[PDB]
Structure 1
């Protein structure tokens, strides 16, 4: 489904695997930007992606999770 989750990536993996499990590992950053990391779990393994917002962190994670799983890297 979509577009109500960070459109292109989230829709890509929501279709491909409508059953991922996202965890937020902690908000920090370079003092002039926040930075969040999400680990997203796709099959038995968690895939980690970093974003200056938790919604971009999970996008990064989930984007790679399915991309890596379909093609590599």
Structure 2
């Protein structure tokens, strides 16, 4: 699969970044997680119900800002 997230778009348009996962909360049926990034020296964040959703949110923010575009 070529991908399903804004993560791969960013990582193909302009790679050269770092990511930092952050802790979780809630019960197993309402669980949440978060994922942050450092791109071009900027910083971004994005929580979600799972690890992929977190990175998709944070990477979409990192993309739109650093790329001066939108998803």
When the two structures are superposed, what TM-score results if normalisation uses the length of structure 2?
A: 0.77
Gapped regions of structure 2 (runs ≥ 5): none
- In structure 1, the residue matched to 2:22 is 25
RMSD: 1.9
| Structure 2 SS opposite 1:63 | helix
Deviations 1:21-53 (A, max 9, x none): 111110113x33111111111111220001111
Distance 1:51 1:17 in 2: 24
Is residue 59 of structure 2 the alignment partner of residue 62 of structure 1?
yes
Gapped regions of structure 1 (runs ≥ 5): none
When the two structures are superposed, what TM-score results if normalisation uses the length of structure 1?
A: 0.76
For these two proteins, the number of residue pairs brought into alignment is 68
- In structure 2, the residue matched to 1:3 is 2
In the TM superposition, residue 8 of structure 1 has moved relative to its aligned partner by 3.7
- Of residues 40, 43, 51, the one that matches 2:40 is 43
- Over 2 Å off, 4+ runs: none
